[PDB]
Design a protein around this ligand. Structure first.
Ligand SMILES: N#C[C@H](CC1CCCCC1)c1n[nH]c2cc(O)ccc12
Length: 207
């Protein structure tokens, strides 16, 4: 288990998301589904030049898994996945410029729902989640588990759990007052409203 400090700009962004009064929390789902969609586009692209990249799984889909017992909402995709380098430094560094631009926009009159237009859409998970776990598997790397309850740090470890093949699993450990996001009709309503034109099948699992 390795512990890392978030880059200063990211930590500020996470504090902003956790502390600002913002009722329109549902936008987190569209951001996560959109990222899943982009990771699926990437793998499909790489498969045109190298068809052997689909050996780790041919199906390109998005699964929404609520679990009321565990109070978790899981977003699973069979996309490109991420390497340990993507989890640690790479994604944090591209986010640096996006965060600055986003924080400047909020000061200029923009709202939190515009987060994805700055490429930092992921962190909107912190509107609803007290902890986020990211399980990922890229073709050129091992299965890793990223985790953060915010507070300026995240952890990375080799995941010894159930193998995935290829893709990313985002586990949202929901805050006590955000259980509506485990309800079928609420999820259906959000997906219909915000993710009506995603080019992959989205399956909402039942409990
Ligand atoms: N971008 C992005 C995040 C990854 C997150 C990893 C840990 C550091 C912060 C970014 C993300 N959210 N949802 C996804 C779905 C994917 O198929 C791949 C990446 C993501």
């Amino acid at each position: 288990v390795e512990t890392f400090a978030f880059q200063a700009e990211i930590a500020q962004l996470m504090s902003l998301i956790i502390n600002t009064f913002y009722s329109n929390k549902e936008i987190f789902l569209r951001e996560l589904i959109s990222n899943s969609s982009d990771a699926l586009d990437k793998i499909r692209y790489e498969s045109l030049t190298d068809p052997s990249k689909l050996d780790s799984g041919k199906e390109l889909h998005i699964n929404l898994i609520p679990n009321k017992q565990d109070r978790t909402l899981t977003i699973v995709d069979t996309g490109i996945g991420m390497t340990k380098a993507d989890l640690i430094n790479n994604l944090g560094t591209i986010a640096k410029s996006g965060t600055k631009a986003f924080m400047e926009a909020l000061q200029a009159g923009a709202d939190i729902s515009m987060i994805g237009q700055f490429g930092v859409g992921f962190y909107s998970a912190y509107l609803v989640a007290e902890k986020v776990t990211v399980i990922t598997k890229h073709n050129d790397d091992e299965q890793y588990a990223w985790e953060s309850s915010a507070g300026g740090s995240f952890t990375v470890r080799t995941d010894t759990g159930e193998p995935m093949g290829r893709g990313t699993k985002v586990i949202l450990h929901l805050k006590e007052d955000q259980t509506e996001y485990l309800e079928e009709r609420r999820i259906k309503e959000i997906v219909k409203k915000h993710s009506q034109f995603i080019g992959y099948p989205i399956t909402l699992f039942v409990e």
